[PDB]
Amino acid sequence: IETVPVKLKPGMDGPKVKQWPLTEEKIKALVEICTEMEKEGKISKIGPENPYNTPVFAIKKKDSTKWRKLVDFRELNKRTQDFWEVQLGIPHPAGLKKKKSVTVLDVGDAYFSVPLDEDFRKYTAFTIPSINNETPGIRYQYNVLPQGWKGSPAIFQSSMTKILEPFKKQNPDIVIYQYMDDLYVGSDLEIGQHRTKIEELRQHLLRWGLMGYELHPDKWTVQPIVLPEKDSWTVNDIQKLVGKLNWASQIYPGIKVRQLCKLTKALTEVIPLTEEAELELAENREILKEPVHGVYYDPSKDLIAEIQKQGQGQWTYQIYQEPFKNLKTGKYATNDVKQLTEAVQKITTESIVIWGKTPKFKLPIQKETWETWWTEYWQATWIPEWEFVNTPPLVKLWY
Amino acid sequence: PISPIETVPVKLKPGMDGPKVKQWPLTEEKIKALVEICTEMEKEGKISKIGPYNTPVFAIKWRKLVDFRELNKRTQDFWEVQLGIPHPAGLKKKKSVTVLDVGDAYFSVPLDEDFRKYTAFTIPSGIRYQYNVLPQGWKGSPAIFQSSMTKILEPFKKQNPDIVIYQYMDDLYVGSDLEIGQHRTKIEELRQHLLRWGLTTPDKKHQKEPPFLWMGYELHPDKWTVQPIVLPEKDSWTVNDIQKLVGKLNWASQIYPGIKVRQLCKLLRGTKALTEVIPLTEEAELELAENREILKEPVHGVYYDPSKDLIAEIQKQGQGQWTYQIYQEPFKNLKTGKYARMRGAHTNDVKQLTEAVQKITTESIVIWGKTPKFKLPIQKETWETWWTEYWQATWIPEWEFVNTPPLVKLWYQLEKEPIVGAETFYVDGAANRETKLGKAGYVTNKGRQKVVPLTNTTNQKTQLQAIYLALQDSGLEVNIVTDSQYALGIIQAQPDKSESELVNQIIEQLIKKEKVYLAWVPAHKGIGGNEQVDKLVSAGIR
Numbered sequence: 001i002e003t004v005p006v007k008l009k010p011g012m013d014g015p016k017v018k019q020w021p022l023t024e025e026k027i028k029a030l031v032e033i034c035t036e037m038e039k040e041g042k043i044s045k046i047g048p049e050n051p052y053n054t055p056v057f058a059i060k061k062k063d064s065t066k067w068r069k070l071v072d073f074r075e076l077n078k079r080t081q082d083f084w085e086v087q088l089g090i091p092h093p094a095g096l097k098k099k100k101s102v103t104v105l106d107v108g109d110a111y112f113s114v115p116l117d118e119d120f121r122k123y124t125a126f127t128i129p130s131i132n133n134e135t136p137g138i139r140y141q142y143n144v145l146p147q148g149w150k151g152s153p154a155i156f157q158s159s160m161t162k163i164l165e166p167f168k169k170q171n172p173d174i175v176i177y178q179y180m181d182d183l184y185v186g187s188d189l190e191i192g193q194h195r196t197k198i199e200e201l202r203q204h205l206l207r208w209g210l211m212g213y214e215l216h217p218d219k220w221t222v223q224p225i226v227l228p229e230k231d232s233w234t235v236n237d238i239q240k241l242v243g244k245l246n247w248a249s250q251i252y253p254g255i256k257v258r259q260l261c262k263l264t265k266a267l268t269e270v271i272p273l274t275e276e277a278e279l280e281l282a283e284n285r286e287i288l289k290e291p292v293h294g295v296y297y298d299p300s301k302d303l304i305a306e307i308q309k310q311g312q313g314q315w316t317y318q319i320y321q322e323p324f325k326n327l328k329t330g331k332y333a334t335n336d337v338k339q340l341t342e343a344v345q346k347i348t349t350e351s352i353v354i355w356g357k358t359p360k361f362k363l364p365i366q367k368e369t370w371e372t373w374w375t376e377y378w379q380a381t382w383i384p385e386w387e388f389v390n391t392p393p394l395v396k397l398w399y
Numbered sequence: 400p401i402s403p404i405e406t407v408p409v410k411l412k413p414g415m416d417g418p419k420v421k422q423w424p425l426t427e428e429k430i431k432a433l434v435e436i437c438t439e440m441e442k443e444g445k446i447s448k449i450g451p452y453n454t455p456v457f458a459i460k461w462r463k464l465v466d467f468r469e470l471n472k473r474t475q476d477f478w479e480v481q482l483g484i485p486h487p488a489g490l491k492k493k494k495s496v497t498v499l500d501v502g503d504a505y506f507s508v509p510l511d512e513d514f515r516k517y518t519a520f521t522i523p524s525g526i527r528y529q530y531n532v533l534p535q536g537w538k539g540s541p542a543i544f545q546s547s548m549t550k551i552l553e554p555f556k557k558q559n560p561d562i563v564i565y566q567y568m569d570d571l572y573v574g575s576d577l578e579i580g581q582h583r584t585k586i587e588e589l590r591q592h593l594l595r596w597g598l599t600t601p602d603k604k605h606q607k608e609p610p611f612l613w614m615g616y617e618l619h620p621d622k623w624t625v626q627p628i629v630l631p632e633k634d635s636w637t638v639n640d641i642q643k644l645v646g647k648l649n650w651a652s653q654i655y656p657g658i659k660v661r662q663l664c665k666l667l668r669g670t671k672a673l674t675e676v677i678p679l680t681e682e683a684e685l686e687l688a689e690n691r692e693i694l695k696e697p698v699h700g701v702y703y704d705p706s707k708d709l710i711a712e713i714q715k716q717g718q719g720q721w722t723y724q725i726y727q728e729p730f731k732n733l734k735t736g737k738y739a740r741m742r743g744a745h746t747n748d749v750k751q752l753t754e755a756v757q758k759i760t761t762e763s764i765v766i767w768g769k770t771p772k773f774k775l776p777i778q779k780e781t782w783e784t785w786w787t788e789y790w791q792a793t794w795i796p797e798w799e800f801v802n803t804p805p806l807v808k809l810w811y812q813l814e815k816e817p818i819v820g821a822e823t824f825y826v827d828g829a830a831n832r833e834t835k836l837g838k839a840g841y842v843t844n845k846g847r848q849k850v851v852p853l854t855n856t857t858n859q860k861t862q863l864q865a866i867y868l869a870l871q872d873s874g875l876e877v878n879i880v881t882d883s884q885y886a887l888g889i890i891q892a893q894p895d896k897s898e899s900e901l902v903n904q905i906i907e908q909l910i911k912k913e914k915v916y917l918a919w920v921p922a923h924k925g926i927g928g929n930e931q932v933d934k935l936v937s938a939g940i941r
């Protein structure tokens with residue numbers, strides 16, 4: 001078919017990101033895949049006359065044995081933004097988050113059938129490195145739509161529509177959403193019916209060639225800030241209480257602490273339970289239980305996720321656009337990095353179902369540690385933006 | 400010759416055009432040299448006479464120096480020639496190894512027919528020429544040359560999987576596990592393969608036959624080491640002298656275990672004259688001494704055996720300094736190294752140990768493509784207690800304990816619950832932003848209340864100074880209540896060393912105590928207790 005012309009955001013040049021070193025097994029994996037992708041003409045060797053580069057990695061399918069190739073196009077996506085976001089954007093259905101069940105299906109292999117504009121191929125160069133830099137390093141570029149690029153779904157959008165048309169027309173209440181490599185399919189059917197409907201959809205996909213991992217959005221609720229229920233209340237326990245309440249005052253308007261804040265003693269000293277205090281305490285937690293009034297999602301602003309390590313396999317997180325004005329909060333529960341990588345994929349996935357975009361992550365870990373190990377447990381086909389933070393003593397707060 | 404190999408298409412940067420530099424006048428001496436030289440070159444096809452673009456040509460002692468600064472700036476970018484350099488420790492043992500150096504690398508490779516016009520130059524009195532092969536100082540020669548030399552070699556490599564070839568610039572290192580007899584055979588089969596592609600190579604002038612000197616190393620077929628290190632032994636030392644010494648030592652630290660340069664590096668601190676004499680201190684004297692000791696007897700490294708595991712051991716030596724060895728067979732070290740990076744203003748040995756493990760793990764992936772198993776001077780218990788309570792996610796590859804003092808440990812733990820029957824200290828600190836005058840004090844539940852005045856301090860410092868007070872006039876067990884998240888954060892990270900003089904003091908107190916409990920409450924919120932202290936700490940001076 002006729003290729004669609006692609007342009008970079010004027011003023012921006014192609015990606016020139018260095019290739020992070022890989023372990024032996026991942027390198028062997030990569031040359032086998034690339035060798036096979038070459039015979040099939042999906043990618044072709046290139047020389048030094050190509051100044052661009054994008055890093056590549058090798059992940060395990062869906063916890064199986066087959067090594068899948070993963071390319072980090074975060075840079076190229078950013079330099080192609082208006083093309084795939086505005087020029088050929090894909091609307092995100094508000095209904096999806098409501099659906100009782102959502103199945104995620106990988107339709108990535110479908111992109112290797114459409115060719116890429118010859119004038120854009122150079123920007124997709126990548127390098128398979130070698131152990132101890134003993135051999136120069138194999139370089140390639142794509143000839144067809146690559147997988148981790150957001151331009152791929154935008155272009156292939158035309159075909160996906162014809163392929164899904166029949167199934168759509170026959171099942172008017174099933175929601176289908178596409179997001180860079182995956183198809184989100186939601187229904188309110190009883191699981192059996194749902195699972196059956198997914199199978200039927202795969203059969204359509206089987207033609208064209210181009211239970212599957214299920215989510216339950218409707219059963220997703222916020223993680224409230226908690227206040228002890230106690231029954232003792234030491235001087236310490238109520239100082240911690242007044243502190244946490246002090247926080248929830250710059251957020252969650254209405255949180256009153258005054259009739260409690262006024263309760264040089266020893267920390268050990270226990271103290272009587274106040275009248276209205278009981279009332280206030282109760283009224284405070286009455287809030288903090290329901291969304292911060294006034295906070296709304298701004299489609300033109302970035303979403304960012306912050307994660308705190310609550311120790312003992314417990315991780316809390318918040319999603320917000322402006323600090324402390326939480327759109328959503330939650331929890332997650334043996335390598336710290338393995339759990340963290342797990343939490344990041346869960347949060348991104350929920351984030352895609354709900355807003356249709358990935359959040360930028362503030363990760364409580366050392367850069368070098370994350371970069372050395374995240375691919376080791378990663379299993380999604382997308383890669384979110386991330387920065388490394390030093391968690392303030394805001395872990396006690398829980399949000 | 401000129402390789403019959405396809406040429407690499409090359410173009411100029413986006414909105415730029417070929418160079419048009421003016422040819423500055425030369426003397427008769429130079430003009431004659433250039434003519435003799437260019438004629439010689441013209442006969443071999445390296446250059447061709449042309450009848451719009453110009454690049455200045457010089458001549459110096461007689462060689463032709465083309466100044467390509469203009470063209471290079473207008474020439475496109477290429478992908479880097481190498482991501483890194485192989486490390487000896489990562490090399491496999493080899494029976495026979497020979498080095499062949501390509502005759503006229505650049506001049507034996509054609510230049511994209513459509514780019515030659517930009518390489519035009521002239522010889523004054525004018526005679527004009529352009530290049531057909533890769534020019535010397537041009538920006539694309541190293542890339543296109545290596546790239547071309549790689550295509551030329553593929554066919555031969557395929558037919559000789561048993562033959563290993565490493566291209567480094569002009570030279571070619573060919574190694575195999577064959578017999579010097581059958582090896583040299585194969586070498587010739589290679590020279591001939593290269594000759595069929597326009598590349599001439601030595602006949603028996605093969606600089607080949609180790610010991611080989613390369614990149615600062617000396618590789619033998621059975622081992623490798625760094626080239627001879629020799630410490631001067633001067634009566635005086637200039638900044639320049641110390642810098643050279645620190646460089647050699649750091650270079651030797653790749654295989655000579657235990658090299659230390661902290662004392663020597665301390666001297667080079669503070670902007671100072673390159674030729675100025677710096678008197679050595681006792682510590683630097685001892686350090687330089689220890690190093691000389693280590694360097695007296697030659698040490699060699701072993702090559703990598705893909706079939707065995709890597710074992711990395713890390714020893715602690717001095718504060719903030721770590722040394723490590725990586726071997727496969729007990730004590731036959733593949734490589735050596737040292738870690739010392741501070742990283743932050745306050746840290747403890749466990750954090751530092753975790754960082755070193757990180758360096759080694761990354762370094763290992765690059766060199767051997769796999770992470771080694773560690774032997775750390777830390778108890779599974781000390782590690783577990785720290786991993787669990789630290790806020791930062793920490794991981795560490797498969798390791799084992801190894802009792803090689805100094806063992807690593809936490810020097811104090813902070814209670815998670817308030818101590819009972821312990822005196823509670825409500826501390827606070829204020830400071831006037833203009834006069835910098837402050838007051839660090841406290842008030843306890845036993846009625847004690849001290850308030851010292853401070854001069855030239857920040858607001859954070861009075862808060863840190865106030866905690867230092869509560870720790871002095873305090874018993875072995877104490878509950879402290881601060882309103883400083885800053886102080887809390889630092890202390891709650893259990894640091895055992897800092898760049899802050901005050902923080903290091905607070906650490907001494909913390910180690911002496913037997914039970915300490917820190918707590919935080921909001922500032923200026925009149926919180927019962929904090930107000931009392933806040934009252935006298937902010938009374939004036941704020």
Ligand SMILES: CCC(=O)c1ccc(F)c([C@@H]2C[C@@H]2NC(=O)Nc2ccc(Br)cn2)c1O
Nearest residue numbers: 485490491493565572609611613618619620
């Ligand atoms: C002397 C430098 C050198 O020979 C050399 C340097 C880097 C490099 F990657 C290689 C190729 C990998 C192959 N060599 C080896 O694996 N081992 C090896 C052992 C002893 C000697 Br001498 C040279 N090489 C090299 O052969």
